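Protein: Beta-lactamase
Species: Escherichia coli
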Amino acid sequence: HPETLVKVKDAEDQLGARVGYIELDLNSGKILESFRSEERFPMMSTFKVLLCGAILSRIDAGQEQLGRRIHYSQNDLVEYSPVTEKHLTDGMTVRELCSAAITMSDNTAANLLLTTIGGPKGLTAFLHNMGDHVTRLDRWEPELNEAIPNDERDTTTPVAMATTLRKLLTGELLTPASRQQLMDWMEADKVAGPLLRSVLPAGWFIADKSGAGERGSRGIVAALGPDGKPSRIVVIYTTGSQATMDELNRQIAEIGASLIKHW
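Structure follows.
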């Protein structure tokens, strides 16, 4: 609805920073609304959804198993590894690592998963193969959150992310089992409290992943809908703002509140 686009521009202007928005029909793939949906933005932690999509894809093809255990050391640990720092001795399974990466945004977990598919370039290669020639990852956690102006590295567009995400949750991309798992992981997101979740009415379904980064970078990808079923995908990114984290959260939550209000 046009009134949501008004609030999107409001967030842009107030934030003093590019905001990127798209809303996509989960059923048809039809673009419902958009604003800067073809401009590149830092993917932030939102890339971890795509990462685990690639991983579930290797499982489907019998080149990986959900239950495979991986061991690592202290030296692999990077900033913000709430789950992985608690398993240096026992290791974690690929399932536990995707759960850590998606539901807890665990950084070292994301890196361990990435090593399995051949690094950032391997996730980029995977994405190419599934028909996304726009989204790219180039660096590892935490460096991929840097958001250097004009730097295309580690970016996607709202349209690319939305359509790739829609392809992973409802397409020929993954087996139904793998789709449901990715969805279930996103539904179990624990670290997007302040965003879309803050304004979501009781009874509504949400499966999401948020990110933050340097230079005021902030974003969220979500499958959401009323009556306990997702019917839409929403992608929001912003980069460049010098507003507070609270203000960034708030602007995104207000965009959510408009999209809910004008559903």
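Remarks: The radius of gyration is 17 Å.
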